[PDB]
Design a protein around this ligand. Structure first.
Ligand code: 7UJ
Ligand code: B7G
Ligand code: K
Length: 265
């Protein structure tokens, strides 16, 4: 396996399938400036004035700001699952797995990948929304009522720390691939094949980081630990979502996410 060619293929698949990259996000977040959403009035103005991928008339009828924000979060989550599915399938070895193992890997991997990619659009003060045309403040998200504020803040804590590693998109492409191709997922049929693919991706990641981050201390083992950390982040996330299902019975949960969280514990 030619690791340079492998890494380049997975980088190109990443650029092909994720419109918002860390490079683009950073060029916005550091200077057409985003519209800042920090309260009800600015959220309303942003719904009227910004271009959103999911049109608002498709979301459930507005009841309160915290639930509307949750629905916008769900929208973006589902859209990123679509992109991650196409990204994964752009990897030949992955598409060679039977479709049931592909689904198992995505089921248990997409939220780990999502929360790693989130750092790309985050800084300590907020995150980009609406394809970079809006910026929602972290203090506004903290202001939402429980339990919605509580499901947001841990992701910021993880993301700010993750951004201290200063990965670029070419690194992230391999890191995300390694998260999806994980031999540890429950119910996987061809564990040895998945473990073998994962191992090739990890070898490509170390090779790539050597070339791309020649001065970095311990970056490869630091990223292996981040993979473990993301497992814990998603465990806690799923536990919170299952609680929302029990205590917020009026709040809609997208059926795809329902399927994803079925049988998690
Ligand atoms: C996909 C990433 C992760 N998110 C969501 C997100 C970011 C950080 C922390 C938590 C988040 O979502 C937690 C709940 C997810 C439930 C879906 C589920 O997993 O079941 C986003 O990119 C995002 C999208 C839209 C907004 C938004 C907020 C106010 C007004 C307009 C838009 C904010 C964020
Ligand atoms: C779009 C990629 C992400 C797919 C995530 C959803 C996977 O859900 C699972 O789908 C299977 C049917 O395939 C069922 O057998 C399982 O009960 C269910 O848990
Ligand atoms: K940051």
């Amino acid at each position: 396996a030619d690791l340079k060619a492998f890494s380049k293929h997975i980088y190109n698949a990443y650029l092909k399938n994720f419109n918002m990259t860390k490079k683009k996000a950073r060029s916005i977040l550091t200077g057409t400036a985003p519209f800042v959403i920090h309260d009800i009035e600015t959220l309303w103005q942003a719904e009227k004035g910004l271009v959103w991928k999911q049109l608002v008339n498709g979301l459930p009828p507005y009841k309160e700001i915290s639930v509307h924000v949750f629905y916008r979060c769900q929208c973006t989550t589902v859209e990123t699952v679509r992109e991650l599915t196409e990204f994964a399938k752009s990897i030949p070895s992955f598409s060679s797995l039977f479709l049931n193992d592909q689904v198992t890997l995505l089921k248990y991997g997409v939220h780990e990948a999502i929360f790693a990619m989130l750092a790309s659009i985050v800084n300590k003060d907020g995150l980009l929304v609406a394809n970079g045309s809006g910026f929602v403040t972290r203090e506004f998200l903290r202001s939402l009522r429980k339990p919605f504020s509580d499901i947001i803040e841990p992701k910021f804590e993880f993301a700010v720390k993750f951004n201290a590693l200063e990965l670029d998109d070419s690194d992230l492409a391999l890191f995300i691939a390694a998260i999806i191709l994980c031999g540890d997922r429950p119910g996987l049929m061809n564990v040895p094949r998945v473990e073998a693919i994962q191992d090739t991706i990890l070898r490509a990641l170390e090779f790539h980081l050597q070339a791309n981050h020649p001065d970095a201390q311990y970056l490869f083992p630091k990223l292996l630990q981040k993979m473990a950390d993301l497992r814990q982040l998603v465990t806690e996330h799923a536990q919170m979502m299952q609680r929302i299902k029990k205590t917020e019975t009026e709040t809609s949960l997208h059926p795809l996410l329902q399927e994803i969280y079925k049988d998690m514990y």
